[PDB]
């Protein structure tokens, strides 16, 4: 499997920042498979809305080569 391509919006609730934050709210990134549970949990805990996740590198259902 080995790779998720995740597009996520993370809004802000705690504060309004002087920084632009257009960098960090709406983003797409490549998270390797055994990082995805932790990353998704963190994104959900920050209050974001995960817009999409895709397979890119590996093949779903493979036993070996994971």
């Amino acid at each position: 499997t080995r790779l998720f391509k995740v597009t996520a919006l993370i809004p802000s609730y705690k504060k309004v920042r002087g920084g632009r934050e257009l960098q960090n709210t709406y983003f797409t990134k490549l998270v390797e498979y055994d990082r995805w549970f932790a990353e998704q949990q963190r994104i959900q805990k920050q209050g974001g809305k995960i817009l999409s996740v895709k397979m890119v590198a590996g093949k779903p259902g493979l036993n070996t080569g994971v």
Partner: protein, 50 residues
């Protein structure tokens, strides 16, 4: 129990890293005022050369 890469991941997947550095900034010396003794220990670490 797990070695080096799980340990690095545990640091970088911590809530603290996400709140302080997020996904965009390179980490840096923080000069932390809290908790107690974190400031001297951090300063000893960051005042040392390689």
């Amino acid at each position: 129990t797990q070695g080096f890469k799980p340990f690095i991941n545990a640091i970088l997947d911590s809530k603290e890293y996400g709140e302080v550095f997020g996904d965009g900034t390179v980490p840096y010396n923080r000069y932390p005022t809290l908790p107690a003794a974190n400031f001297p220990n951090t300063e000893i670490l960051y005042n040392q050369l390689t």
